């Protein structure tokens, strides 16, 4: 909605709206900067869980760092409390369940504080009195701290009253016991948020390295220091050019995997495109399009296409 930047005046009685509006503007400003370089500046930084109570059909989060599409960053390690335990008793008939972190919508018409009064909708804010340290001196004072009213909900539930972000998926094992699905990938703000994607990404890089080292040994020497390239090496050069150009770029993205997946996608798609020139078994529509909400429909099929393209590249 509207953001009313406050004007600070000499005789003025200080109002909560002045501080609320200033804080809202700063959130919008930081979000507008993020949008200059990225199409989707929201998603999971960290989504860690305790699996110990899964045989008792209970799921607890240990660490949640998630940015919502409205620019609100939630951080249980720094500013927020962990959401209450997720009870899986209602999904005893299911084999699969998608867990979402839910943040109630901010109501521009007020009533955002969950004060225990009745409401037709969930309230975004909770107030907790915390003895907060005064940083210049040595005193502490009890201050009303803003706590986001976060809950772990399920994707099949009615969630329009909340901003939601996929945070895990649970699947039943051979015994029917709930366990976190390793194939799950949430919308990403960092690559590190998904350890399985990281394992798959490291596998691709290793496969690329092995393939390019094998292809680099296959060039005929023009002289002692220069490579010989003829009409017969049309496939050999462009393959080597594609692998040699991409490998140091992909290596630096993977060595510090704390950036947005749009950066990685761009380079992975560029490499896939370059390799498709020598394949007859694919369309060029083969490169999966980038969809932020479901990275499972972009990175696993793109890594699958790349691994197949690396193997078949020898001709």
């Amino acid at each position, epitope marked *: *909605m509207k953001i009313y930047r406050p004007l600070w005046e000499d005789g003025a009685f200080l109002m909560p709206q002045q501080f609320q509006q200033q804080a809202a503007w700063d959130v919008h400003l930081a979000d507008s900067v993020a949008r200059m370089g990225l199409a989707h500046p929201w998603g999971v930084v960290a989504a860690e869980f305790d699996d110990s109570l899964l045989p008792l059909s209970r799921l607890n989060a240990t660490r949640l760092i998630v940015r*919502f*599409p*409205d620019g609100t960053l939630i951080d249980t390690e720094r500013a927020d409390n962990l959401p209450p335990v997720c009870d899986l008793s209602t999904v005893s008939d299911r084999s699969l369940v998608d867990i979402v972190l839910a943040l109630p*919508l*901010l*109501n*521009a*018409n007020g009533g955002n504080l969950d004060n225990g009064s*009745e*409401s*037709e*909708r969930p309230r975004r804010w909770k107030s907790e009195r915390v003895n907060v340290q005064e940083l210049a001196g040595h005193e502490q004072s009890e201050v009303a701290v803003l706590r986001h009213n976060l809950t772990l909900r399920m994707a099949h539930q*009615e969630n*329009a*009253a909340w*901003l939601t972000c996929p945070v895990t998926r649970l699947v039943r094992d051979a015994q029917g016991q709930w366990c976190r699905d390793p194939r799950f990938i949430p919308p990403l703000l960092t690559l590190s948020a998904s350890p399985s994607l990281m394992t798959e990404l490291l596998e691709l890089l290793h496969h690329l390295q092995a393939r390019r080292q094998r292809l680099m040994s296959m060039r005929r020497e023009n002289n002692a220091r220069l490579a010989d390239f003829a009409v017969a090496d049309v496939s050999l050069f462009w393959l080597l050019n594609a692998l040699n150009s991409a490998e140091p770029v992909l290596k630096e993205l993977l060595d510090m995997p704390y950036r947005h997946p749009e950066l990685l996608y761009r380079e992975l798609a560029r490499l896939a495109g370059s390799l498709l020139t020598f394949s007859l078994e694919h369309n060029v529509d083969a490169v999966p399009a980038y969809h932020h909400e479901t990275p499972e429909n972009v990175f696993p099929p793109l890594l699958s296409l790349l691994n197949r393209l690396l193997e078949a590249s020898l001709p």
Partner: nanobody
Amino acid sequence: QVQLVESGGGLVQAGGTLKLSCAASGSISGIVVMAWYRQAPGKQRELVASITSGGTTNYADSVKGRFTISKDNAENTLYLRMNSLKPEDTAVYYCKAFFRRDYVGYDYWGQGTQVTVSS
């Protein structure tokens, strides 16, 4: 924006029945939940009943088992069927829509309709 117009209000005897209507127009696709609120003379506004866009109903303890909230999506009309009306049900009844646009929530209200239960 969402426009709400209430109708069906009036005078009824104790133990009687009334059906309130609320016609919704405008950006209807954004409505998350619709509700009925009431303001009795000299009392604060109170939530009576609510219905999500998906049809999940909820009632305040004071009206539970007596009132029925329903929605006609083909006509974009909210209904409140009120049975076993008591003098404490006398109030101005307001239609409300909790609307969602671009990750933000908004409240829209009707003008209200007078409901009087005589003893």
